[PDB]
Structure formats: C-alpha cells, structure tokens
Amino acid sequence: NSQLTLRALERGDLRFIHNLNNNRNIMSYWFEEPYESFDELEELYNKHIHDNAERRFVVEDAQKNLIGLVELIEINYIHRSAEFQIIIAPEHQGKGFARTLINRALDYSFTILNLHKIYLHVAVENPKAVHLYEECGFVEEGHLVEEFFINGRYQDVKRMYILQSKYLN
Amino acid sequence: NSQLTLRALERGDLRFIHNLNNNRNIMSYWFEEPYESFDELEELYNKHIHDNAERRFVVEDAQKNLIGLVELIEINYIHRSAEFQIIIAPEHQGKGFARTLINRALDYSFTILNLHKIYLHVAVENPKAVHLYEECGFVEEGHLVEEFFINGRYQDVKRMYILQSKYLN
Amino acid sequence: NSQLTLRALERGDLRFIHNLNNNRNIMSYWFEEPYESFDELEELYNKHIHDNAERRFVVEDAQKNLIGLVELIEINYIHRSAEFQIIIAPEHQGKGFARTLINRALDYSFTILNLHKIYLHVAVENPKAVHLYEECGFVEEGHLVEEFFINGRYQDVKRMYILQSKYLNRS
Amino acid sequence: AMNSQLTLRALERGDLRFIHNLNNMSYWFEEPYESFDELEELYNKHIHDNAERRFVVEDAQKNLIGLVELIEINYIHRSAEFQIIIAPEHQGKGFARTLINRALDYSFTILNLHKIYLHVAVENPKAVHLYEECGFVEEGHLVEEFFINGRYQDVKRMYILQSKYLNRSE
Amino acid sequence: MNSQLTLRALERGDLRFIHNLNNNRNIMSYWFEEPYESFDELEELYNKHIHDNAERRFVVEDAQKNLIGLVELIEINYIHRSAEFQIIIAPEHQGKGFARTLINRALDYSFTILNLHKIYLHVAVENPKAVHLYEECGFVEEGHLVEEFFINGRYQDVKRMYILQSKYLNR
Amino acid sequence: NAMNSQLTLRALERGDLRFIHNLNNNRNIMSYWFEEPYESFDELEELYNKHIHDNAERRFVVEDAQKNLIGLVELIEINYIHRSAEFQIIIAPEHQGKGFARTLINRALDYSFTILNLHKIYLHVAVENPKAVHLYEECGFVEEGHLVEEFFINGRYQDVKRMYILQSKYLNRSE
Amino acid sequence: MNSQLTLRALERGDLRFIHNLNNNRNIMSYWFEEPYESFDELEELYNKHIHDNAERRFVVEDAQKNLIGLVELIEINYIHRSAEFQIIIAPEHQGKGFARTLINRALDYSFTILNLHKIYLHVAVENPKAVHLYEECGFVEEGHLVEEFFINGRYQDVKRMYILQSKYLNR
Amino acid sequence: NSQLTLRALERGDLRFIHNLNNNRNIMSYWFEEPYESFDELEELYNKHIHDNAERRFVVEDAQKNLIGLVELIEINYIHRSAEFQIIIAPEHQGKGFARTLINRALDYSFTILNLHKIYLHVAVENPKAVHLYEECGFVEEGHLVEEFFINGRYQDVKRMYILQSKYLNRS
Amino acid sequence: NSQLTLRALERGDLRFIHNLNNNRNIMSYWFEEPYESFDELEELYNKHIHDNAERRFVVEDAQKNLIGLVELIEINYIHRSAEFQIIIAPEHQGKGFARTLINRALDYSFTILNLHKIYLHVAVENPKAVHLYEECGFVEEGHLVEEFFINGRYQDVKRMYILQSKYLN
Amino acid sequence: AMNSQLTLRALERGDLRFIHNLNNMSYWFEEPYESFDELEELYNKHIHDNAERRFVVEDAQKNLIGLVELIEINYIHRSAEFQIIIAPEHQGKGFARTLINRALDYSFTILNLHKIYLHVAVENPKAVHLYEECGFVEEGHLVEEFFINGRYQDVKRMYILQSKYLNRSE
Ligand SMILES: [Mg+2]
Ligand SMILES: [Mg+2]
Ligand SMILES: [Mg+2]
Ligand SMILES: [Mg+2]
Ligand SMILES: [Mg+2]
C-alpha cells in the first residue's frame, strides 16, 4: 500500500481518463464541459491545457500499473479551496487503496498546493462511502437536497470537508 | 442482446456511418447540414464536435462487430426533448436487436441526460415498425401529412412519443 | 390590410426584434441559438447572414410603422417544408392584421420560394388562434403532448399544416 | 409602487462599466479579472456562453439599481446559483424581495430549472431572514468557506425547488 | 429624349435601387449566382464579387439623373464569348419607349467593347409582346424551355433568344 | 447486362480528383469546377477545398464490383427554387461501347428525382453527335432548344441540342 | 517520336524544373509579371497566382517522362484575344527536331480551345535561324523592336512576330 | 574555379549563413535589421523574401560544397548602384577562389541586373584585400575616416568602385 | 537666425515636405522607400513612425513660417554614424540660414543622440555648398564617381564628414 | 583547458526549456512570467527586440552550462546591465571568470557600449571579489533593494567602462 505515487496528468493519460469515466452512468466533465467520446475529450484537453482551475493526478503502483485518478476541481485561489474526487479503476477497487490514495491527495493539497480547505460530495444512498470519508477525518457541513439527477432520480449528497489546519496537527 | 454495447461515436466511426447511408435511398444530415461525400462528413464532424444538440452511439456486439447506430437529435435543454432514430446494418436486421437498442437509448435519455420527452417519426407505410414502437411504450401523437419526400413521393409519418414519467415507472 | 408590406429583415430591424421579445416571456432563438441580450443577437445575426435555413420578413404599414414579424424556420429544400411563426407588436394586436400577414407568408412560401408544405405549432390552450389558422386553410395533423415548457408547465400544442396545392387552388 | 417599476434586461457590453464600478476579487464565467480592459476581453469571449446569465436592474427613469446573476447553470442536473447586488445608493429601499422573485420566475418558468441555491454570509442574518421569507431553506452551514475582511467566515447554503416556488399559493 | 439616356457601371450607392427594383417583381434575386433577400446579404455579396468579371451591370439614368432601370449581363464566358442579358425598367418608366434604346446600348457594349460573339436572353412565353420587341431588335428564337422557372405560383415556359456579333455589327 | 447492374455510384471524394483530372486527358475542352476554370491537378485540388460545402454541383464516381473507375455523373447549376439542374455523364475511353451510358443516365435521373426531389433535368449535346441525341431520346429526354454557335469546340463554333425530362414523366410512367 | 511528346499543365512539383531551366539562360525571370531569383520566391508567386488566368504553362514530356521543355502563354487578354508565346527547350534536347511540334501544340491550344485571335512572340535578331523556324511555322514579322531588352551585357533588338487564328485554322 | 557556381539563396542555406557569422566577430544584418540567433534570421528571411534592395547568391563547387556568399546590398534602381560583399567559408580561404567569385558577381551585376556602378568597403588595415580588388578593376574613390567600429576601435575603410562600362569593355 | 527653431516632424508636416519635392528634379525616399504621391508618403509615414533609423525636424521662424527641413538618415547605433541633409524652401534661400541649421543638426547629433560621425553628400558641381560645409568643419573623405543620376547624367559628389570630438572642442 | 572549450551562441526558441528550468520570480524583456507557455509567448513577442540579448553557454559535448544576459541596453547612453547564471551541476569549476570576459568582449568590441554594470547581493562577497578581480568597481551600495529569502537585502552596484576594459594590459 505504501507503493502508491501521484503523478501530474499528461496527454498520454487521456486514454485512462476515458476508460475510467466510462462505465459509470453519470455525465463526465472536463473543465465543466461534458463529453462522452475520446475525441471530444482530447479536443477539450487541448482547449484547457493552460487552465489551472482543475488539476488531475494519476495514481500508480511500484510497477507503474494505473490504479486510479485524483481530481481537484472548482479550484479557487483566493479562498484556497477545492472540490476533491477519486476514481479507482474497477479492477483495483476493494483492495484497500482508497484510504491511502485519500491521505496522499490530502497531503498534496495541504503541503504542496497550500489549500486551506478540501470538500467533496458523497451520495446519501451510499452511507458506506460517507463513513469511509468520515473515518478519513472529513465532516458533514451540508446535506444538499436533490442536488443531482443520478440513475433516473434526484438524490441528496453529503457535503463533507476537511481544513488544512486540522489535517496538519 | 444483453451483450450489445453502446459507445459514443469517434472519428474512426465516420466510415461506418457513411457506409450505412448506402443502404438508404435518402439524404443524410449532420447537425441539420446535408452531405453526400465522406469528406463533407468529416468537415461537419470537426465543426460540430462539441455541439450538444445531437448525440450518437455506435452499437457493437462482444466481438466488436459494428451492429448499428443510435441517434438523438434536436436535443433541447429547456423543453427537455429530443428526436430519436436507429439504424441497424442490413446483415443484422431481423435478429431481434431493435427493441434492446431502443431501450438503451431511452435509458440514456431518461436516466442520464434527464430529458422529459423522446419522439420519433415512422413511415405510416411501415406498420411493423409502428407496432414495435407501440410495444416499447411509444404512443401516436400525430399523423404528419406528406411530411417527407421518400422514394419518389410525399409520404405520411407517425410522430410517436414517450415521457420520462412512463419509462421510469 | 392592403397597405401592409413584407420586407426582408435587415440589421436595422434587430432592435425591433429585441423589443418584440420583451413581453413574450419565452426563450428566443436565432438559427436555433438561444439569446437574451441585444449584443448577443447582433452577433448571431452577422454569423448567419448567408444561412438559408431561416428567413424573416418585417411587416410595415404605408407609414413604415413596425407592425410585426413573419418567420420561416427549419426550412428544408429537399422535403420543401418550413415552420411558420407570426408575431404582431402588442400595440398593433386586435386590429385584424393577423389574417393578412398569414396570407402574405403563404403567398411568399408557395408562389416564390416554391415550398410544398407549411406547418406551425399552436398552444392547445389558445383555441382562438387555432380557429383563426383553420379559417386560413390549416388543418390539425397532431396534438403534441407536453411538447413545450411554457410559463411554468408543460403544455400541449396542435401541429397544423397547409400544402402548396391547397393554397394555390383556393377560392 | 417603486418596486413595480423595476425592470430586468439582459446584460449588454455598454453595462460593463456599471459592473466594474460595482466592485469598488471579481470573476467572469469563473475567470478572474481586475481592470476594465480585462472584463471587456472576457465578455467578448463568453458572449454566447450559456453557463451564466446576468440581468441589470433599472427604474423608470433608467437609473442603474443593481444586478441579478445566475451562475453555475447546469442543464442536466437543472440547477443554478443565484446572486444579487444592489448599488450602495439604492439599498434599504425594499427592492431585494422584488428582484429575488423575478430571478426565480425566470429560473423556474422559462429556464425550467429544478433547483436554485445561493450562499449567504452567516454574519449577515438579515439577508438570511430575507431569503427564508422568500422560501429558501438552509441545506448547509459551510465552515470557514470564504476569505472576507482579512479572515475566513462561515456561509449558509440555501435552496429552493421549482415545484415549491410555483405551487406556493395553491 | 432617348439619346439623353445614359449607362454607367453600378456603384455601391446603387445597391438600394437594385434591391427595390427586384423586391417589387416578386421573384428570387441572385447576385453572381448567389441568392439574396436581405439588403445586408446583397451588400456582402457586392463586396465579395466587386472585381469579378462574370457579370456586369449598368444603371440607366436620364439627364435629370432619374433612375430609369438596369442593364445586366451575366454568365459571361470569355472562351465561348457569350453572355446572358436582361433589362429591368422601373415600373414608372415602362411604356415610354426606352427599351429599344437600352437593348441597343447593351448590344453595343457587348459587341463593340467586350468583343463577345453571342448574346442571349430568356423571356416568358406569357409575354408575347416582349418576344416581339426582341425580334424587332434582331433576336431570334433558338429554344422554348419547358417549365424552366417557377414564377408567381407556377412553372412557366420561356423562349431563349439570341443575336450574334456579326449580325449586330453589319446592320 | 450482368456488368450494368453491378455498377455503383458514390459521392466524389478528394482521392477521386486524380481520376477526374485524367478524364480530361483526351477531351480537348476547357474544364471547370463550380464554374471556375482550371487545367492542372494542383489547381483542381484547391478548387475542391474551396467548394466542398457548396450545393450548386454534385458529382458521383462510377465503379464496378471490383472498384474499377468507370466514369462520372455530374449535376451542375442546381437551383432549389426552380428545382432544376444540368446533367453530364463521362465514361472513361476504355469503358465505352459496353452499354454503360443507358444505365448511368437512369441512375442520375433516379437520384435527381427520388432523392433530390428536383423537377427538371436538362443537358446539352453536340448537334454533330446524332447518336447521343438518339440515346437521350430513348431515355425520355426531349429537344427544347437548338442553340446556335453556343460553344467554341475544336476550332469552331458549334450548335447544341438542349434536351430535358421532367420528374413527373420519369416517376409516373408505370403508375 | 514527336507525336510521342505530351503537354500537361504545370504543377507545383514542376517548379524545380522551371527554376533550373531559367537559372541556366542567365536572364531575369518573371512569374505573372513579378520578378524572382530565389526558388522560395518562385514558390510564393506560384501560390499567389495559382488560379490567375493571365498566363498558362505546360510542361513537355516524352513517353518515358523525360522533361523536355516548356510552353508558356503570357499577357493573355480575353478582350483583344491575344497572348504572347514562348517555348523553352532544355539544352540536352535542343537540336532534336522537337520545336516545330511544340510550336504547333501551343497554337492548337491557343486557337482551338482558348479561342484566341492572335498569338505573338519576341525573338532575338541575333538568332536568325529561330526567326526562320517561326516563319516556316506561319509567323510573320510585324515589328523590329530596337534595343528592347538588356540581355547578356547589351541592349538587343528583337523581332515581333505573329500568327492569326484564321490563318492557323485554314492550313 | 570554373566549377564554382552562383545560385540564388534559399531558406535551406540560412544555417550556412548563420555559421559564416561564427568567426567574423561583427554585427550581422538582414535587410539592415540586426540579428544574432538563427530563429531571428529565419524570421527576417520570411519577411523580406520579396524585397529587391538586397540579393544573395550561395557559392557551390561541382560537389555542392558550400564555398561562400556573394551579397549585393543598398541596391538602388534609379542610380543603378549597389554595394558588394563577398564571404568565403574559412575552410575554403587561401585557395584562390576570391577572384573568381568577384568576377561572377560583377558579371551578374553588369550583364544581367544591368547596374551602372558597384562599390565596396575594405578595411584600410587589410592592404592585401585592397590590392586584390585593384587587380579586379576597382579603384579607390574614398578613404572613410573612422567609418566603422570594428574589434574594439574605429577604423578607416577604402570605398572602391567599378563601372559597368569599364567591366564590359575589359581585356 | 537665432530665432529659428527645430521641431520634430508630425503628420501635419507631410504636406510641407511633399511640396518641398516639387522644387527638386529628383526622386524622394522615406526610410529608403521611393515615393511620388502624398498618399504613398502618408502610408510610408504610418509604417515607419517608430523606426529610429531616420529623424526629421521642421524648421520654423518665430512667426511659424515653414523654413525648411533637417534630415538625419542611415542612423546606425553601433558605428554611431548618420547621414545629414538639409532643404531650405526656395523663398528662404540666400538669407544666411543654412549655417545655423547645420549647427543645430550637429548639436542634436552630438550632444543628445551621442553619435560619433556625421557625413553628407554634396554635388561636386556645387562648390559653393562644398565651401560652406568646409567652413562648418566638414572635411572631404571621398569623391564618389558617377554616384547619382541627376538632371540627366551621372554626377560626382563629395562625401564630407565631421566627428563628435572636433565639434565638441 | 575546459574553459577554452566554452562557447556562447545566441539564444534560440529551442533553449527556452533550459531557461525555464534555470528558475527551479522571472522576467522577459521586463515582462513577468511563470509557466513555460507564458515564456514562449513573450519570446515570440520580443524576438527582434534589441533592448536585451542572451547567450547560452555550452561545452564541446554540447551540454548546457549556463547563460549570459545583457539587459537594459541603451544606445544613447551606451550602457547595459550584465547577469550570468551557471547551472547548479556546473558551479565551482572556474567558468564564471571566462564567461564574464566573453560578455565584456561582446559588449565593448562589437556593441561599442561605454558602460557595463551589474548588481550583486552584498551577502555574497565571493561574487563581489570575483567581479573586482575582473575590473568591476563599486559605485553603489543599494539599501534594502531586493526581496530575497523572505526579507530585503542590500546589493552592490558595480561597473566597468569600455576604455578601461580594452586598454587593461597597455
Ligand atoms: Mg464551476
Ligand atoms: Mg432544428
Ligand atoms: Mg452558371
Ligand atoms: Mg503586362
Ligand atoms: Mg541603407
């Protein structure tokens, strides 16, 4: 589990991005523009390559297998906040990486990027995930009502946060 | 049937959709622009690559044979409607695939794009397709008189619809 | 009514078009692109100036007051059909002008542009408009269920049509 | 009386000066800017972009009263964030309520959105009250969210849904 | 009075005259084989084709500078040395005897300056007097084009009529 | 007859331009692309890029089942108000006198009248080619004009027949 | 062997042949009346004048595709129906009898396809045998231009010689 | 010497030009614009490709080795004069090539470009170069006092010239 | 003489310098580009407005009459040299102004641009101007043979110079 | 030996990566930048601008050793500011002296400048020594001039004149 690195995303990784944001039955976005096809995604990559409102990090193991993806979006450089999201590739889900990847993401965000606050959205219908992020130090600050249409109905999500000052004690 | 997949159209697919027009004595359109040559198609494709008014999925089996095409056009995000069509390659017709593909398209339209109405047009002189869409839950809402010039004369078409609220319950 | 003229829209008429949107309370489109501001419209106008999929005619009286707009949209030159809409400025409604403008539009469509079919959508909750189009030769070919979100809810519309051969042979 | 003569019209290029003066950090389609030149460039870039929509507010003599914004507009989830700014010289006149309701009319009867939400500083319970009286309910108390006046402050997230707004009096 | 009529090459400033002329005949107008309705469309086509030598147009004026009409040559092919000719006279000046003079000026330009070999035109079969005017100017019928144009509500036949350089020059 | 039925028509593409160019090889006439003249391949290529979306002319390359290049069907001066167009067919010299012309004329008419929904097709044919005049009469075309010294061809001015057929005559024969 | 020579219209790929040909005659070369020395200059002029019909050029090849020479028409005026002609034969192929054939192909194009009326050329007075070759091809002297060109160190006289369409077509 | 050819400079030769600057230790100019980097030069090249105020010729042997450069600058077509410079790559100096290149440049200037006067500047502290140009027909017309800052100090240069009439009448 | 001023050329001055070319049977140049029409001059002016290779001053008296033109061209900032010329309008010739204007130009060249050498060209057949520039401290450094075609034949000119070190002491 | 194989050549577009890596705040013709994209845009803008001039330094095997800069070049007053940067991996090898003298050769024998000056952190007296041994003399002790390492530091301004450099050994 200590074998896991975050690498900044490069053009070559878009194939992985696409494979991941695939069998997920939700709309996938790149800098808030939606895409389904690889070619749509590439054209978006080229259009937003200099924009730093979102920052993505590919996660690899010791033999550089692609394990998953860390995204930060809605980055705001005045308030120093960002929305966190994680995708583990289906083949590596359930092996114990989620916790490790999360703490690596927090470490990157809070030391290297010097962000003040990280948040995320977790479906309320997934109380397992909620409890996971809880165990990793996140706390509820919001119960967003019918925020997202997911799987043919409107759903609530927990808004959960952690501050730099708490993670660094 | 259960092994049929939908995949968003890429540039590599244009040859396939172009060949699918051979077996159709009719004019084809890309984002409401007519075309005949592949080169015209490729230019239209580049031009409308992020245009969200239309969406197309290539159908394949598990062997990656190219089975057909699912199209949603005239997507309107205010009225939350879209027109649906399907083309199945000649060799794969009368294999009972149509029903499955129709349902995949409704599924996409209603569970992920969060649309409210899906309509289509069926030649009145194809009461077999008429009946199939009835079986899928579409109902007639119009009988358009001399709407389209097809095979050397003006022909009526049914306009058939189904609503998000019926498909999801 | 005889002093009502049709004239191809121009750039100078855009301010009139924009003001016709004021009390209509729906989304306005230019060649299927949505807009609200005058600056948006002016720019869509310049982009689509050679695009033949829509055509528009300002309606003026003998004194060049701006009376209304005739629009043809979704024009298709294979099937030879188009969708028709008419808008009369509120200060000119209830003066019987609509019938004349409907006929001028049909005349242009069927005697100059050489289309085969004209069709339109009318709110089911506006039976006067429906009856008006009926008197002008239109016939219901559909009752479209919850087709448009209009003013807080989905409404049904009649789709009504007339053919070139019926208009041209009329008494 | 005065409220009923307030009008909304879509923001034009000529209104960008008014906008600039309203900030005496700013954003335009989530792009950051400071100088009037910067804003005007961003405006030309996003003129047909439908993710945000602004209305400038005027009285009968055509004075500039303030601004209604819808941002973060998403047409899948059918939601948007609402902000209102009233010029200093026209505050404490009752306008806010009138404008909030126009923005909701637009959002729910023309855009056909499902959910409108806003953020309001917790250290401004008068605004909070106002939004509650308009039908907004708290769904979040966001901890140390926005750097405001040399320090981080909590903000309320409040929302209202299409069907609640439209059927209110039924 | 007829020797007092002048041709001068069309300028930008004459576009509004051209547009009114054509507006009022209820036909679809074309500029360098591209279609237009909107003045702004005419003006852009004008800027695009300004040095293009496939069409040439002359505005006709009297000595008082009243705008009389228009002489057009189109489809000008410099290999086959042919062009299509048309004349349009403003309605207020029709019937005054100007047409023969204008037809001859057009021929004189075509045959003594551009050095063309053949000039031709189309004339509605339903206008036999114009047929006769052109015959009396030297044109002969070489075709009866069946349902060639859709004009004011129906498909019309037109006569195609021509004259050769050698014939016009040896009168 | 066997080979006639196996001919296909397909929309002209960029890679077909060499073929179009070679087709002018022993034609001794000025060739045009959307009414602009040209002579070299490189000239033609640039004209093709320029009018790729232009709907006033349409061209179909003709091939057999082994994808030999048989010839070209060309519709020009397409007008969608009057609903008319001018038609030409060119068969490569090696594939002439195998009966293909009749078949390709019928395909062009079929496309024009059942897909484009045009009302009239016409063509021009050299008065000095009475054999083609007769072929077009057999396909339903009728003389509507005898155009005097219309074109300069091979060193002198020549007359042409203008011949037409109407959609209603082609589609209603067997109705 | 002479009937086995072909003309085909100049392509981009033939620019290097043209440039070597002209390099080696020690004269100042022009492309569409604009001067060049540098190949890169030739290539840009090529791109700029690619559809311009005032000059036309044909590369001459044998059956084995050896590059033989060049036939040029310039100053092509479509009102007066005249052009200036030149032929350049690569030095290795001079003396082989190709010239008469090339001159005739050039005339055939000029007079049977472009429908020109007059073709002319300039020929150094100090090359009386070429004068004679052109006479024997039908050209007649119509001018002796005095010190017209500065060529290889001095001002040279040239003969101007022409032939008419009517004469070439009735041989 | 006879196998030395002059050829109009091209884009591909720019790397050679840049390397000729390496051990010269002076400012280099392209059409009077100063440069040091290859990227600067490449861009000045594209800008001035149609500019006739300077002209340059790469010198190649029979084996296409790059031997040197002939430049004409400050060319004026009224007065018919230009300034001349010659540069031989260091690995080709001391082989007697300079005289041949000087003559090739004069030949081009006076027999093709038709100039009247060629002039050049030679460091007074290089009397061999001076004597060389003298043998080629140049004559001192000035001794320019502290004209150029060269290698740490102002130096004098001879201005030397030859006229077209003297070069062309020479033995 | 002491009341003559130098003023940098503006757009408003182009008519003046254009009229000054009438009284000169010679071709004029603007940044080494030839021209004849005013419109050509105006385009050249716009194009070279910040080009520092040439500098021009209009001479006026205290009444603001337009007396003449002082030009410095071929300004080189490495070799620190420039060519000087002067034109005095016909009506103002033989008023003893020339000497004064020459000195103003040297003054500018040597005290403000910090140039090292100033040269000029004088027709050999104008020994009167030759002598004047000698009196101002210019010395002959060349006798350029048939340098310029003037009034229908090639003519010699002297090239005369003066150095910063002589003018300032 | 190693010093004599150092070469200078004018900066090209291909060298901008090397430049970027040398900063692990930066300026380009006095315009500020951070990302590699930013620099490349500034480079295209100032490619023919003569107010600054850069030379990249290479050995015989063509490794990138460092950079010589002349900036603030003024051709009236005939002066410029000099900076030298040597890559970390090649420091403490004696190169600096060799490069300083090449830069002065260029400035005084080809540009014909009168004065070259530099700024050097007062808290780096080794550099100061080096520049003095090269003929530079202090003309200023600039108080709290440059923010460096979270605080303001003094810097020496040092200069040398053309005639002093060129006649040194005479
Ligand atoms: Mg956002
Ligand atoms: Mg549509
Ligand atoms: Mg035509
Ligand atoms: Mg000429
Ligand atoms: Mg110069």
Swiss-Prot record, chains C, H:
Matches recorded under SUPFAM superfamilies: Acyl-CoA N-acyltransferases (Nat)
**Keyword Transferase annotated:** yes
Question: InterPro entries from the xrefs?
Answer: Acyl_CoA_acyltransferase, GNAT_dom
Q: Name one GO biological process term.
A: spermine catabolic process
Q: Where is the N-acetyltransferase domain?
A: 4-161
Tell me the active site: 133
Q: Which reaction does it catalyse?
A: an alkane-alpha,omega-diamine + acetyl-CoA = an N-acetylalkane-alpha,omega-diamine + CoA + H(+); spermidine + acetyl-CoA = N(1)-acetylspermidine + CoA + H(+); spermidine + acetyl-CoA = N(8)-acetylspermidine + CoA + H(+); spermine + acetyl-CoA = N(1)-acetylspermine + CoA + H(+)
List the protein's name. Answer: Spermidine N(1)-acetyltransferase
Organism expressing this protein natively: Vibrio cholerae serotype O1 (strain ATCC 39315 / El Tor Inaba N16961)
